[PDB]
């Protein structure tokens, strides 16, 4: 039964954890908006071998995930859960957090994402050979940009994305339910203070984030089967642990 002071402390603790574990400054991301990949640079990315592009993307994705792990470690209550349940929440939720965090690096006006120094459209990622997944991800980020999240809101939202009591294989499900509820309290508390509770009904259905993650695992299966050596030799071992079957 967390008091109003406990809830207010949980809000500040969540927003601090988030500020400290972002790979990119929001000030830089908006500064680089005019910096967009040229028609020649896009063609270069499109003419990369599949293995090279996958390798690059898997590296950058793993990097972002390392920041998500750090976010989890500083998240109030996460380290209080048992070891097994930390693993489960992170394994299922790491990619989900990154997909949400992506909207900070996403420009709605020209439908571009900040990638390897500049902004580019989903056309950049054609050498991956999974255009349905890429465009799905760009659609998801575009829907989040319509919500006009502030940093504090993303912080509180991504915390709820991570702490999800419905993940299969939780050893102490009830302890997870209690922390999830408190973070919901923290979320609703901050929103109501800012007159922003109207976004709650506009939040993506939880099955959409699972679907994107399922889609990623499947596209890795297609790639790993065609290129098993590349994944074994070059891919970050964390990426293989989290996403490979």
């Amino acid at each position: 039964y967390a008091s109003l002071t406990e809830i207010e402390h949980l809000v500040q603790s969540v927003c601090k954890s988030y500020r400290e574990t972002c790979q990119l400054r929001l000030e830089d991301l908006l500064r680089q908006r005019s910096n967009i990949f040229s028609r020649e640079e896009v063609t270069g990315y499109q003419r990369k071998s599949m293995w090279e592009m996958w390798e690059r993307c898997a590296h950058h994705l793993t990097e972002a995930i390392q920041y998500v792990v750090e976010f989890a470690k500083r998240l109030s209550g996460f380290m209080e859960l048992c070891q097994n349940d930390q693993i489960v929440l992170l394994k299922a939720g790491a990619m989900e957090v990154v997909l949400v965090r992506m909207c900070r690096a996403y420009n709605a006006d020209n439908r571009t994402v900040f990638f390897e120094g500049k902004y580019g459209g989903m056309e950049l990622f054609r050498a991956l050979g999974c255009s349905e997944l890429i465009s799905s991800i760009f659609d998801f980020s575009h829907s989040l940009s319509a919500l006009h999240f502030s940093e504090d809101e993303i912080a509180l939202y991504t915390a709820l994305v991570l702490i999800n009591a419905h993940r299969p294989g939780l050893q102490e499900k009830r302890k997870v339910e209690q922390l999830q509820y408190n973070l919901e309290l923290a979320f609703h508390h901050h929103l109501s203070k800012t007159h922003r509770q109207s976004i709650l009904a506009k939040l993506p259905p939880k099955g959409k984030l699972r679907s994107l993650c399922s889609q990623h695992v499947e596209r890795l299966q297609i790639f790993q089967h065609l290129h098993p050596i590349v994944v074994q030799a070059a891919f970050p071992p964390l990426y293989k642990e989290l996403f490979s079957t």
Partner: peptide
């Protein structure tokens, strides 16, 4: 596992 290692 690697997740275990990163969490201590």
């Amino acid at each position: 596992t690697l997740l275990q290692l990163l969490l201590g």
